[model samples]
Target: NATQINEELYRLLEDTEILNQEITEGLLKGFEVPDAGVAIQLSKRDVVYPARILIIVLSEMWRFGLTKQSESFLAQVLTTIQKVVTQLKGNDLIPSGVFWLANVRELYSFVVFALNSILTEETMTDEEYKEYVSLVTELKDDFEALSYNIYNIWLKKLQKQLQKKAINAVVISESLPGFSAEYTMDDILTFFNSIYWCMKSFHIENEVFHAVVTTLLNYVDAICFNELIMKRNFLSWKRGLQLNYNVTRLEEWCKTHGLTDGTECLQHLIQTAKLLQVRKYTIEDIDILRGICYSLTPAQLQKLISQYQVADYESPIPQEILRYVADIVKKEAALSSSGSIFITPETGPFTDPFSLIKTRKFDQVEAYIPAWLSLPSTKRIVDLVAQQVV
Candidate 1:
């Protein structure tokens, strides 16, 4: 009885596809969506998945042959997706774009499974398979392209954000001796939290988040490390400890977040920080420094040694000890790789979220939208049905 009732509702909606035109238009409007803006503590995980769920209903309508204009209808849906993503900008760009991104990725995977799941079943004719293959292939490509387009835009936004904050927050702030400098560390950490929680709220998969975090760490390494090298004031012993503490805090963050590539990217900066705090008074101390800081090259060590500023009450490194370590490092120079010391290598965006989603067959897919979304398209159908029953 429930199946008959559901089929009746589907038939009614299909009949009105051209006549009333309201349901399709409403879905297009619903697709144009965005943000967890009102509350910082709120998560969009509950609200965002409804869009993906409706996409399945659209896919099912086509697969089950309920809509004769499937080709044109799906095409318009693709364009609507593009339109929604294109409209996003500024503060809304990242969170909203990622929301669309995850949803689009889900849609793509569903279609992929749709293509595979349908072709293997006994119900399809040769003509049906051919048409379905071509249409679904086009659909898949469009979504894939949109996913990459959103991802690149997301990265550029993140790059611009970190480019401004990295140096001031990491290397320059809290310079006064009495300052905790811990608060300065919090500034950088908070930036990570903002991005982290944003991704988490939008349901970005964990692996994808890890890749994004790694890219950020590398970008910050480029910005802060190069700046730390040139700035004379930051090379002091006291500031060195602060730098070490800041880095350690970041390392702990990576650990807690389960960042697999964590701290590995920060090795150069870690060694540089150690170079500031290490004892360089005696040849034995120099030997210990050399063994501990192999991450830095001979030339890098020499530059840092030349720039070393003795703190208020600290003793300066002996001239002979510095020269001896320099000569020893030079001897080891030929063995070094001399990799790009200030690399700001262009990192690509994360893997396809489709790789992680498990898509079910068309018949098994649920068509209901969560009430939380209150999507206009679904509401139109519900109200129309309620009036008919009354």
Candidate 2:
């Protein structure tokens, strides 16, 4: 009865994956087959990982003996093995010349452990599991001698890739926006992408990539809050400074907020800036500022613009940069000696030392109100009205 049943169980697996089906039945009949042991060997460099997966699963089937109750689960197990193996093999899990000139009786432990992980206990008892553990243990030693050699081979391949790319922290830092003089957002993006495949190729992590990205972002922190570049019309003061917008004419650059520099440098800079709080300004805002340069110190212009507080709103030019350019123009004007009156407003609520000026007693003073009111300083107007009232 057991012999007939074993034959039947073998048939259940035979249709889906025969390599494993033969191995399972042969092991039961005490018939040794060369293909049975080496069907899934990582040594011979099999192109299909699922073939190996099928054998591992079939070996389990032999150990457990597929019962009627367990047959459904067993079938599902085969399906899962096929899927996982297909995925691994698709990734190019093999080494050609790297397989060394020797025997591969078994696979290293993890390959088996990984294959073992998908095992679903359909209808096996605790005692059967204890013996199953013992069976794989002895088999585990057989596997211990020369499995996973290909992984070492792959390690060298990955190392060669890293070497070929020639990337490191210093090189990366020099390529960042603030730190490097010659790079762009697209460039940085490309840099990361270049290494990504090598990482995937070797099944390695992005530990180095993370560190470089962190340093790149920290460079932004160094420059984010610093004063905008104080300059006139944003004309080329910094080396390699240029605009990215489509507007080519001088009038276009003259318009408020009509300029942007999407160069690789600005791209990285902007990306970091997006993460922070800041005042954004426009091209129009910059030109409009040049007109007021005579009246305000660059520092004072900076001081006044701070009143126009705006924070990170999505757009091209940062308000901080615009303000800095305005600051420079403002500085140039202040030095030009074109004079304009500037005053400081009082710290508290407007006092009417001019309180009486607002009263009916100053009704006569009100007629003169037009004269005082017309002046730039309401405080000055209020002072005169108060005097007349007195």
Candidate 3:
């Protein structure tokens, strides 16, 4: 009975004409406005009805061997949401619309996770594989196009608004009447939030995702530059130095934060660097780090030495290197010098006069010593050099 009922419903809904008509005239209209008021009203409720509905539908579809159909439907839903985003952008409702766009992206991710679990088995047929690829490719292309359009058009417009606000603030300084209006930190925060939301909605593996993230980071840098020019110092900037440490790290950040790939990308980057013979502790490897430091902190300098394990005196450094770090820990803790314990010029009471005079003359004479000498004598020579150099 269940099979017959399912077959009947499937046949009745299979026609593109019928399905498209229903989607266009019925479901689309019903969800077009998406009563924000109702959404807010439902938010106050202790229960999560919509989420429960989604879970139930997903579970039933997966358990009843309808995963393919469910995946296709979910992709269609994402496309429809993308269409709504375009409409909203056309109407100049970006910051608010981006919020809904992010929700749709989250739903799309859920569908992707569920579908991947079902489709990753070894028993999948060639035809099923092709169909899955086609569906995913279609959705990917659509989302990619939407993402680029949003960046090229809507993002520029938003940036112009920010610049306008900044200009107005500058022109309306305390010296000028009606020039007191200023763009608060909240305005800048809102601008970044909008850009980040747009980036988040984009599918991470898509090229557009990378482009959007790169552009947003550049925008952040531009804002920072302007801030420095206006404020004459890095006001609230942090992580600027760390972010510029390695090119691989920048790519990893884009993949991790923009693409939501977690820390795997960063780990891969580290591995790649190691494979390429790029030691992690060599700050000189990256020019950006040098620029950021201007003058390295003592901690940073120590870390650099420890990281590279510079050669010591006992183990001479290579000829190719100009200088190498020495491990100071191996040296004695207290400062010592041969001159610190000097011998007074007093004659021994039991010494023969002629013999004692000869010994005293040799001891006081300045002459080159042979390589073989008492340890104290060698140390004395080293201490003399150190005192002169230091």
Model 2: ten consecutive residues of lowest lDDT: 356-365
**Whole-model Cα lDDT of every candidate shown, in order:** 0.65, 0.32, 0.36
What TM-score does candidate 1 reach?
A: 0.75
Cα lDDT, model 3, residue 57: 38
Model 2, range 1-390, lDDT digits (tens) per residue? 555544544455444344333323322111111221112333221322222333344343554454332344334433332233233321132222112101121123233553354254444666766655555554444334222332333333433333333222212222324521333334333433433333333222234233222333333322321222222232121211222111112113223222222122123223212212222356565556445333334554443344332223535556566557666757776786765212321122212121121111101112121221122222232333344344
In angstroms, give how far residue 36 of model 1 lies from its true place: 6.4
Q: 1-390 in candidate 3: lDDT tens per residue?
A: 556544543443344355433433333322322223211332211121222223333344444446466565545544564565455532235443444333333333344444465457654567766765566555545444444444344445454555555333321222223321275434444444445444343212244343443444444334432332233122111212212233233344455445554233233222222322332233343333334333333233223323332223323223322132222222322234433011121111211111111111111112122233222322233333234333
TM-score of each: 0.75, 0.23, 0.36
Each candidate structure's count of clashing pairs: 0, 12, 1
The alpha-carbon RMSD values of the candidates against the true structure, listed in the order shown, are: 5.3, 34.1, 34.7
- In model 3, where is the ten-residue run with the lowest total lDDT? 356-365
Selected candidate, larger TM-score, 2 vs 3: 3
Q: Which candidate's TM-score is highest?
A: 1
Candidate 2: where are CA atoms >4 Å away?
1-6, 11-56, 64-133, 141-150, 167-390
What would the per-residue lDDT of candidate 1 be over residues 301-382, giving only the tens digit for each residue? 7777778888767898888987886786677775667554455646566555445556423344333444644455455444
Estimate candidate 2's alpha-carbon lDDT, on a 0 to 1 scale: 0.32
> CA shift at 50, candidate 1, in angstroms?
5.8
